[PDB]
Amino acid sequence: APFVAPNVQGRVIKESGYNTKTFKPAYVKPKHVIDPNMIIPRQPGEALGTG
Amino acid sequence: APFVAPNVQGRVIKESGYNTKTFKPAYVKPKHVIDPNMIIPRQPGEALGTG
C-alpha cells in the first residue's frame, strides 16, 4: 500500500484486465481403396495350395 | 567483589544508567475511483452475447 502523509487526499491505484484464448479443432480424413488387387491375393491364414 | 584488607574502609562501587527509544508510526491511504468505465465492461464469468 502507498504511504501517504495524512494531510493529503490519498493515492489512486490502477487495475488490470483479463484475456481470452480461442481455438479451432483440426480435421483428419484417411481412407483406403480396396479394389480387387488387394482382395484377391492369398492372405496369411489361407492354406497353401488351394486356400 | 574487591579483596580489602580488613583494616581499611572498603571500596566504593559504581552503577550505570538506562536508555530509551521512541517511535512514530507511518500513514497509509490507498483509494480507488470507480467510473462507469470500470463497472460496465464484461467481467469474465459472464456468458457471451447477453452477458
In this complex, is the C-beta atom of A13 within 8 Å of any C-beta atom belonging to chain B?
yes
Three-state secondary structure call for residue B36: helix
| Closest CB from B27, B28, B32 relative to A12 | B32
C-alpha cell at A42: 492369398
Burial class of residue A28 in the structure, from the number of CB atoms within 10 Å of its CB (0-12 exposed, 13-18 middle, 19+ buried) = exposed
Contact between A3 and B26 under an 8 Å Cβ cutoff? The reply is yes
Q: Determination method here?
A: cryo-EM
The CA R_g of chain B, rounded to the nearest whole Å, is: 37
Which of A35, A18, A3 shows the shortest CA–CA distance to B44?
A18
What is the stated resolution of the deposited model, in angstroms? 3.3
Tell me how far apart the alpha carbons of residues A47 and B3 are, in angstroms, rounded to a whole number.
123
Q: Which of residues 16-45 of A touch B (CB under 8 A)?
A: 17-18
Contact between A3 and B27 under an 8 Å Cβ cutoff? The reply is yes
